[PDB]
């Protein structure tokens, strides 16, 4: 209103939006509760190496202390320790835990792992190997079935066994190889040749057993070369499905959308009006288009390599319109991991 | 100005015959003027 | 004036009838303000133009 003469003014109402990118690694470390040696607090909050130093001076050959040496070895980050018993609780709470190690870690981990995911809070845990030494002359899948599947996770057998200390699980041992692959670029970069550092693998693993293996599940050995030295080794989700291999285009996935999500939560109980709908659509693909000449997503021609589709009868019809709810889609074309090579010779 | 104002004056549009011979002219106009800016409210946006 | 009166009461009494208060503000002093007929109509508001 107007109501006394004079001077009133009014500005500017709502603006645009963009999504905040990632954090693509907050590892929760698996705490065994029933442990001594430690802080019997289940849930450890650590930030980097100076407050866990100042937690643990005290050299242990625990894996999680092992894991923690290693993992802050190669610059880590702000990555916690919980227990077995407080997995879902503070994924409830802290809503940044990407990763999920097994610290040695199985029975309740792995319920506990597909408890959530039977609620899917958009997270990729992985596993470890099994111990020592698969004879592998027989038994070829009987050393799967005790990890649950789903497109997340993988176990990396080898167990790593780090000369220098005790024997370390490889999930601790390939978030470093992660640790410098996000750090290096990105997450649809598979962190399949990033070489670690004074770990020595408890096994020369094979060619064959590893090729033999490399299919059915997610075994993903990690072997040692010439040149490359103790690198990381085979890139593949659980399943060996067309949609789901390839971990990183999985965990592209696991990636795209928890900005998004995350983002948009102050956009509700606004006017569900068609002025709405393109300006929605207007923000993402320039990201996406970003995202795409990034290189992170396959393909030219970039309203090819995604699509994007919105409106009032393309989505979202009336009467849930009326029931106020508002449906989007996308699908897209990503990248995927170039992990077998053949070659063709010709003398023409 | 001429829309501004209107002016009208005639023998049908204004003025018929028996009035005219009743000795009776009539005429109309009707304007544009101005009005008194009395309020202000003034928009910003950053674009 | 006798009295410094408003901006609210002035803005509460602008509408309805041609109350026109009178006010003093700083740079223009004692100045007159407001114009508007008794009547809030579209036709006749607006003092001059009336």
Request: negative net charge; proline residues 5%.
């Amino acid at each position: 209103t107007t109501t006394y003469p004079g001077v009133y003014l009014s500005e500017d109402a709502v603006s645009s939006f963009s999504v905040n990118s990632a954090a693509t690694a907050v590892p929760l470390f698996a705490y065994d509760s029933e442990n001594t040696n430690t802080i019997n607090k289940p849930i450890q909050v650590f930030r980097n190496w100076a407050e866990f130093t100042v937690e643990y001076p005290t050299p242990l050959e625990d894996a999680f202390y092992t894991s923690l040496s290693l993992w802050f070895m190669h610059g880590g980050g702000k990555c916690y320790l919980v227990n077995e018993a407080n997995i879902a609780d503070a994924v409830a709470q802290y809503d940044d835990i990407t990763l999920i190690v097994a610290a040695g870690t199985d029975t309740t981990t792995y319920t506990a792992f597909t408890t959530v995911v039977g609620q899917g809070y958009r997270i990729f845990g992985l596993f470890d190997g099994p111990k020592e030494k698969i004879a592998g002359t027989a038994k070829p899948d009987e050393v799967m079935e005790e990890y649950p599947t789903s497109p997340f996770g993988a176990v990396f057998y080898p167990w790593g066994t780090l000369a220098s200390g005790a024997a370390v699980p490889p999930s601790a041992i390939a978030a470093a190889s992660i640790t410098q692959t996000d750090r290096t670029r990105g997450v649809w970069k598979a962190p399949a040749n990033q070489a670690v550092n004074g770990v020595t693998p408890a096994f020369a693993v094979s060619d064959d057993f590893q090729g033999k293996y490399n299919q059915g599940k997610a075994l993903n050995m990690i072997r040692t070369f010439s040149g490359q030295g103790t690198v990381v080794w085979g890139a593949r989700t659980l399943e060996d499905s067309d949609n789901w291999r390839y971990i990183p285009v999985r965990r592209l996935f696991n990636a795209v959308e928890r900005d998004i999500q995350k983002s948009l939560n102050k956009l509700v109980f606004e006017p569900n009006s068609q002025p709405t709908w393109q300006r929605v659509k207007a923000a993402v693909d320039s990201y996406l288009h970003s995202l795409w000449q990034q290189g992170a997503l396959a393909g030219n021609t970039p309203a090819d390599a995604w699509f994007v589709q919105v409106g009032k009868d393309l989505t979202m019809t009336q009467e849930e319109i009326n029931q106020g709810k508002m449906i989007i889609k996308i699908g897209l074309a990503a990248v995927r991991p170039a992990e077998f090579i053949i070659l063709q010779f010709s003398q023409d």
